[PDB]
Design a protein around this ligand. Structure first.
Ligand SMILES: Nc1ncnc2c1ncn2[C@@H]1O[C@H](COP(=O)(O)OP(=O)(O)OP(=O)(O)O)[C@@H](O)[C@H]1O
Ligand SMILES: Nc1ncnc2c1ncn2[C@@H]1O[C@H](COP(=O)(O)OP(=O)(O)OP(=O)(O)O)[C@@H](O)[C@H]1O
Ligand SMILES: C[Si](C)(C)COC(=O)NCCCC[C@H](N)C(=O)O
Ligand SMILES: C[Si](C)(C)COC(=O)NCCCC[C@H](N)C(=O)O
Ligand SMILES: [Mg+2]
Ligand SMILES: [Mg+2]
Ligand SMILES: [Mg+2]
Ligand SMILES: [Mg+2]
Ligand SMILES: [Mg+2]
Ligand SMILES: [Mg+2]
Lengths: 267, 267
């Protein structure tokens, strides 16, 4: 009555966090699979009858309303960006993040972060809008990754940011606090450091990094024409979903043809 | 008192459809530019004070609510897809659409359409959901294009589709009709033809193609495991915005760092 690795992997695809089912109790694979298949078909039928919204889409909409209502302008900027942005962000051609970049043709890449486009918007909008400038964006970003439990190659970033008055550590933490309180997600702030921005305030849920946040100014500002105080933070939406729904693997949360709202589509 | 091409191009960037300003009345460039700059700064200040929603984001949300309320499941599938999907869609390696594909690395590409991922979802969901299967997706798609007035290289597609009962020409036209009536956009349906799907019902606003729609079955179905009647239609959101806002160029509607809700960001 032992299960093979293939059998265990199939049952794990079909298992969901709310289940409490022992995969190696000695019940045969056929019965465990049939039970989980029936649970998951019922779950998908209930989604189709009663809500029909995609978790990533619904969370984006929820986050958008939060930031629009707090005075931030909603941005939708290019996902396909100049490759020259990477070197200008101080991503040394090197190894690290630089090796994670998906190149497109000769001179383009898929953005790995929203920051460069938002920096350009802060600079441009400061010529027309009253102080402070508050903007945010949600959308796809791309990195080649090796890991699998907390990393996706195609994921969804929120970055909000502000330039002008009010760009203090305490106001940044207060926005993060109000935001994650709105989502019902507990967290702590820990110092960390990265090659692009320097010191970061990392927003942690246990050992899971939900965000890196930054208080400017930083030396990179000159190369982007940023010449005022600023604050900003980038969050992964699939990581937020992973926490909210207690997923074991971030792939449950991803754009995917393999899962719908964390339910296997292989039924 | 004549304007150069550079001067005329600058004024056209700053002009908006609601203006009624003659660029070559003989008023000097400096006064025309100052007047338009003041109008556009006021327009952006009003957006920032009172709405703050991005046109593409807001239209996606409006469309999503429409289709969710009509019983369609909201899908968010990969934008970065296998290159093998292109050949399997019958996009002959050839010239035409095939030359329009943005390749990523060796084996991936940016999707040029939502159809292949939605075909996979229809097939998979038919194993779990009751007839008919109704799904839709909105999101970025990518084509190398030459044109500039009605084409973008990075644009936003809506595709809705249905499989099972009810997949008739009359029901397809009725959905299109209810949808564009909800948006307030007049249209007509004209026959056309394309290499992937064959005969299409093209949804036209004047000479502007808003959508191609298709009544299955088609011979491509076998290669995607589709084995029931189906209907579907793909719409460009920036083209819908172009019509709604009377933009002269689709770039006003695009993801862009150069325009915000059709207003130049170069102020
Ligand atoms: N590959 C990925 N998949 C999913 N989410 C990610 C990925 N990379 C980054 N994020 C999310 O985006 C946020 C901001 O990006 P940032 O550059 O700080 O990530 P990071 O420090 O490289 O994250 P990690 O150390 O976990 O790799 C991260 O805190 C995380 O929530
Ligand atoms: N490059 C583009 N930019 C903006 N919208 C586009 C683009 N290509 C297609 N669309 C939109 O997507 C819809 C469905 O795609 P489809 O493949 O039918 O386009 P198409 O027939 O190639 O359009 P066209 O003949 O105008 O090039 C189109 O009706 C249009 O509204
Ligand atoms: C020219 Si700048 C990149 C140095 C300053 O202005 C911005 O572009 N603001 C949004 C991004 C800030 C960092 C982001 N918060 C993060 O740590 O993920
Ligand atoms: C395996 Si199929 C591609 C042959 C059938 O099922 C679907 O994938 N449905 C959505 C896409 C249909 C065509 C789209 N409406 C268009 O003309 O843009
Ligand atoms: Mg990382
Ligand atoms: Mg980190
Ligand atoms: Mg980080
Ligand atoms: Mg075309
Ligand atoms: Mg056409
Ligand atoms: Mg067409």
């Amino acid at each position: 009555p032992a299960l093979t690795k293939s059998q265990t992997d199939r049952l794990e695809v079909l298992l969901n966090p709310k289940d409490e089912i022992s995969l190696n109790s000695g019940k045969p694979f056929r019965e465990l699979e049939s039970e989980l298949l029936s649970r998951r078909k019922k779950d998908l039928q209930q989604i189709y009858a009663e809500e029909r919204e995609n978790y990533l889409g619904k969370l984006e909409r929820e986050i958008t309303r939060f930031f629009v209502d707090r005075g931030f302008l909603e941005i939708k900027s290019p996902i396909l960006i100049p490759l020259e942005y990477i070197e200008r962000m101080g991503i040394d051609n090197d190894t690290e993040l630089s090796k994670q970049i998906f190149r497109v043709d000769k001179n383009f890449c898929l953005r790995p972060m929203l920051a460069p486009n938002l920096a350009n918007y802060l600079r441009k909008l400061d010529r027309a809008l009253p102080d402070p400038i508050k903007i945010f964006e949600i959308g796809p970003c791309y990195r080649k990754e090796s890991d699998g439990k907390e990393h996706l190659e195609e994921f969804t970033m929120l970055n909000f940011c502000q330039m002008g008055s009010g760009c203090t550590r305490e106001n940044l933490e207060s926005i993060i606090t109000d935001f994650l309180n709105h989502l019902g997600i507990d967290f702590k702030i820990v110092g960390d450091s990265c090659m692009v921005f320097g010191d970061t305030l990392d927003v942690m849920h246990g050992d899971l990094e939900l965000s890196s946040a930054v208080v400017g100014p930083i030396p990179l500002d000159r190369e982007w024409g940023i010449d005022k105080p600023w604050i900003g933070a980038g969050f992964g939406l699939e990581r937020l979903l992973k926490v909210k729904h207690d997923f074991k693997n971030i792939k449950r949360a991803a754009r995917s043809g393999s899962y719908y709202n964390g339910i296997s589509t292989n039924l």
